[PDB]
C-alpha cells in the first residue's frame, strides 16, 4: 500500500531533519531494532548516537554490528563517533542524556500507559530538554481508509500544544503516508516536530558502547 514501507518513511523523515539541521548528539528513545540509529550514523555530523529501550531482549546482539569495521580504520572519520545502547525507560530520568541536540520518539507514546504518559513530557521536555524533539504516533482517522491508545489529529495536536507551551517549545505538525480519493483523512503517521525557543543520575543500563577511530 506504501511504495517504501511506512516504518522506513518514518526513519527517512528523521534522516532528512538530521541532514537539514546536522545535530551532533542524537538519542532515539524506543529504538527497538536499532534500524534508525543505523540510518542516522551514515551522516558524519553525529558525534554521539544513543539508543534507549525497556526491552533488553530487543537490544541483544544488535550492538555488535554498530562497532567500527576495518574499513572505518583505513578510511577514518573526521571526528569521533560514540554509539551507546541503553536498557531503560523514557519515564525515568538519566543524566547521561542531557544536552542533546535531537531526541526522537518514533511510534513510542502509544505504548505508554496513562501514568507513564503523564510522566513522559516531564522527562523528555522538562529534564532532558534537547534542542529538538520529534514525536510520531498513528492517526486513527486513517484506519477506515499492542497500542494503549489510538489518537486522532486533534487529540495529538492538543496534547502536543499543551506540552509545547509548558516546557517552552514550538510545535509544527506533519506526517507520512498519502491517503491518496478522500484526501481529508490526513497522513497515516502523525508527526510533531518540537523546537526549543547538575546532579549525576545514572539509572539506565548501558548494554553496549563503542567508539570509532578518527583523524582531522
Ligand atoms: N517506557 C519505555 N521506555 C523506553 N522504550 C519503551 C518504553 N515503552 C515501550 N518502549 C519501546 O518502544 C518501542 C515501540 S516500537 C519501536 C518503534 C521504532 N522507533 C520504529 O519506528 O521502528 C519498543 O521497542 C518498546 O520496547
Compute CA distances 29 → 36, 47, 97, 110, 172, whole Å: 10, 17, 10, 13, 20
Q: Residue with C-alpha cell 555530523?
A: 45
15 CB within 6 A, ligand 1: no
Cell of 120: 513522559
Is 58 one of the annotated binding-site residues?
A: yes
Can you name the residues that pair with 214 across neighbouring β-strands? 77
134 CB within 6 A, ligand 1: no
Asked whether 87 and 63 are in contact (CB, 8 A), the reply is no
37 CB within 6 A, ligand 1: no
Is 126 one of the annotated binding-site residues?
A: no
59 CB within 6 A, ligand 1: no
Is 202 one of the annotated binding-site residues?
A: no
In terms of residue numbers, what domain contains 23?
Answer: 1-216
CATH number of the domain within which 86 lies: 3.40.50.150
Task: For residue 162, report the distance from its CA to the centre of ligand 1, in Å.
Answer: 23
Looking at residue 90, the DSSP 8-state letter turns out to be T
**For residue 53, which atom of ligand 1 is closest to its CA?**
5
Domain count, the chain: 1
Ligand 1 atom 16, closest CA: 32
For 3, counting Cβ atoms within 10 Å of its Cβ (0-12 exposed, 13-18 middle, 19+ buried), the class is: exposed
Cell of 204: 539506565
Of the candidates 63, 60, 69, the residue with the CA atom closest to the CA atom of residue 50: 63
Asked whether 91 and 116 are in contact (CB, 8 A), the reply is yes
Is 64 one of the annotated binding-site residues?
A: no
* E strand or H helix at 82: strand 82-87
Cα–Cα dist 197/216, whole Å: 33
127 CB within 6 A, ligand 1: no
**For residue 136, which atom of ligand 1 is closest to its CA?**
21
Cα–Cα dist 103/86, whole Å: 14
Sign for the CA dihedral angle at 54, 55, 60, 62 comes to: negative
Ligand 1 atom 10, closest CA: 30
Task: For residue 138, report the distance from its CA to the centre of ligand 1, in Å.
Answer: 14
**For residue 10, which atom of ligand 1 is closest to its CA?**
21
25-29 β-sheet, strand order: 169-176, 189-196, 132-138, 102-106, 25-29, 48-53, 82-87, 205-211
Amino acid at each position: 500500500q506504501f511504495k517504501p514501507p511506512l516504518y522506513r518513511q518514518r526513519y527517512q523523515f528523521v534522516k532528512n531533519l538530521v541532514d537539514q539541521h546536522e545535530p551532533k548528539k542524537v538519542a532515539d528513545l524506543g529504538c527497538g531494532d536499532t534500524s534508525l540509529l543505523r540510518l542516522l550514523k551514515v551522516n558524519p555530523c553525529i558525534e554521539l548516537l544513543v539508543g534507549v529501550d525497556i526491552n533488553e531482549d530487543k537490544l541483544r546482539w544488535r550492538g555488535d554490528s554498530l562497532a567500527p569495521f576495518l574499513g572505518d580504520f583505513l578510511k577514518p572519520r573526521d571526528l569521533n563517533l560514540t554509539i551507546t545502547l541503553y536498557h531503560g525507560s523514557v519515564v525515568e530520568r538519566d543524566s547521561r542524556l542531557l544536552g542533546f541536540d535531537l531526541i526522537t520518539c518514533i511510534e513510542l507514546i502509544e505504548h505508554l500507559d496513562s501514568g507513564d504518559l503523564a510522566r513522559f513530557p516531564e522527562v523528555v521536555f522538562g529534564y532532558l530538554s534537547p534542542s529538538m524533539i520529534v514525536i510520531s504516533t498513528p492517526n486513527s482517522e486513517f484506519n477506515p481508509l499492542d497500542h494503549k491508545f489510538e489518537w486522532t489529529r486533534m487529540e495529538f495536536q492538543t496534547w502536543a500544544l499543551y506540552v509545547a507551551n509548558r516546557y517552552d517549545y514550538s510545535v509544527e505538525f506533519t506526517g507520512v503516508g498519502e491517503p491518496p480519493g478522500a484526501e481529508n483523512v490526513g497522513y497515516c503517521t502523525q508527526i510533531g516536530i518540537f523546537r526549543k525557543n547538575q546532579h549525576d543520575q545514572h539509572v539506565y543500563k548501558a548494554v553496549f558502547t563503542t567508539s570509532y577511530p578518527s583523524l582531522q
